[PDB]
Amino acid sequence: SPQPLEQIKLSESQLSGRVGMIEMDLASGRTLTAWRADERFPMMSTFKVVLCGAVLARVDAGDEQLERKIHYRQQDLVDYSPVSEKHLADGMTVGELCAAAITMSDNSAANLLLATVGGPAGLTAFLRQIGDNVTRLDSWALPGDARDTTTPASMAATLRKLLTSQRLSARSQRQLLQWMVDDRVAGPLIRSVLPAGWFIADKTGAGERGARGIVALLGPNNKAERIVVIYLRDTPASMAERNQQIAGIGAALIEHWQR
Ligand SMILES: OC[C@H]1O[C@H](O[C@H]2[C@H](O)[C@@H](O)[C@H](OCCCCCCC3CCCCC3)O[C@@H]2CO)[C@H](O)[C@@H](O)[C@@H]1O
Ligand SMILES: *C(=O)/C=C/N[C@@H](C(=O)O)[C@](C)(COC(=O)CCCC(=O)O)S(=O)O
């Protein structure tokens, strides 16, 4: 592989789209690689991590419990509900909802959780509270449309704040991390192509006009050493090719880790 920056450029050339990327030390926030890091990209399903960060903040505050069972009706389901569609009779706990939202990208689960935090406005106020003045959720992907967007730099900083600053309790930090470790959409596939010793936790996203993304923890020696945030937008490429390009940026990181 070429150097990370060289590969990121090759990916834009090959995809005819914009790539946005930041590689950041999880413990300190040291930024190693930053490309279009202040440009806006659609968050897609990656918002579900921030959502559950807000849910955990309510738990910490004593205004929510992960045990609490939510009952919902079939009429409340939205498109793509692989887990939530199975519990019309018995409901799901708030904690189960977050697991389903993060690990399966369950949209009904995310929708039910979003209500509990005051909707898109409420989640955006949560972001402003933790010092993210850029990321915004507006909805329960055209150029010029800033709705439901973040930047690589903002998303990386926010993920670091949620996982490591003392904004969430120790138990809540550990919970948010474990949900990302447990990703079923891409986690196991990623492990299958990762060399031995490499840690992965992640949340993926996909959307219109080629939108595709991942927010992840990666490192050698089985450690969550770095946050890596990669977003793509405005490419006509197949899903398979978008995946391959993101994987190629991963390969360049892996080969050239010591920077
Ligand atoms: O010298 C480093 C390594 O080089 C190769 O490993 C390859 C691997 O065989 C391939 O499967 C992967 O593809 C990259 C797949 C990563 C996909 C997910 C990455 C995510 C994670 C973080 C967010 C961005 C993308 O690249 C590495 C580096 O060339 C050798 O196979 C391996 O023995 C060796 O230890
Ligand atoms: C989150 O990014 C959601 C992406 N797409 C879904 C949506 O718009 O709600 C779909 C239903 C596809 O969802 C999946 O394939 C599950 C994995 C999505 C993910 O990577 O998180 S829609 O067809 O695009």
- CB neighbours (10 Å) of residue 107? 20
Please, which residues bridge with residue 150 across strands? 41
Q: Among residues 239, 102, 221, which one has the least CA distance to residue 159?
A: 102
Q: Whose CA is nearest to atom 17 of ligand 1?
A: 247
| Cα-Cα-Cα-Cα dihedral sign, residues 159, 125, 47, 229 | negative
161 is an annotated ligand-binding site residue: no
| Cα 110 to Cα 162: distance, rounded to the nearest angstrom | 18
* Ligand 2 and 108: CB distance under 6 A: no
- CB neighbours (10 Å) of residue 225? 17
| Cα 60 to Cα 58: distance, rounded to the nearest angstrom | 5
The technique by which this structure was obtained is X-ray
Around ligand 1, the residues with Cβ closer than 6 Å are: 1, 190, 193-195, 200, 214, 216, 218, 228, 230, 246-247, 250-251, 254-255
> Phi and psi of 185, rounded to 5°?
-65, -50
Q: Whose CA is nearest to atom 6 of ligand 1?
A: 195
Radius of gyration of the chain (CA): 18
Interval between CA 85 and ligand 2 midpoint (Å): 16
Q: Whose CA is nearest to atom 20 of ligand 2?
A: 205
Q: Enumerate residues 6+ apart whose C-beta is below 8 A from 59.
A: 65, 66, 94, 172
- CB neighbours (10 Å) of residue 160? 17
Interval between CA 139 and ligand 1 midpoint (Å): 35
Residue pair 39/17 in contact by the 8 Å Cβ criterion: no
Please, which residues bridge with residue 202 across strands? 216
- Domains, the chain, ordered by start: 1-259 (3.40.710.10)
Resolution (A): 1.8
Q: What is the full DSSP assignment across the chain? A: ---HHHHHHHHHHHHTSEEEEEEEETTT--EEEEESTTS-EE-GGGHHHHHHHHHHHHHHTTS--TT-EE---GGG--S--TTGGGGTTT-EEHHHHHHHHHHS--HHHHHHHHHHTTHHHHHHHHHHHTT-SS-B------TT--TTEE-HHHHHHHHHHHHHSTTS-HHHHHHHHHHHHT-SSSHHHHHHHSPTT-EEEEEEEE-STT-EEEEEEEESTT---EEEEEEEES----HHHHHHHHHHHHHHHHHT---
- CB neighbours (10 Å) of residue 223? 14
Catalytic residue IDs: 45
48 is an annotated ligand-binding site residue: yes
| Cα 105 to Cα 81: distance, rounded to the nearest angstrom | 8
Q: Among residues 159, 173, 172, which one has the least CA distance to residue 130?
A: 159
46 CA closest ligand 2 atom index: 2
Q: Whose CA is nearest to atom 19 of ligand 2?
A: 205
Q: Among residues 141, 179, 13, 31, which one has the least CA distance to residue 21?
A: 31
* Ligand 2 and 172: CB distance under 6 A: no
Residue pair 39/170 in contact by the 8 Å Cβ criterion: no
Task: Find the angle CA(113)-CA(57)-CA(186) to the nearest 5 degrees.
Answer: 55
Q: Which two tokens stand for residue 2?
A: 């070429």
Q: Among residues 255, 254, 253, which one has the least CA distance to residue 8?
A: 253
| Cα 213 to Cα 204: distance, rounded to the nearest angstrom | 6
Interval between CA 123 and ligand 2 midpoint (Å): 20
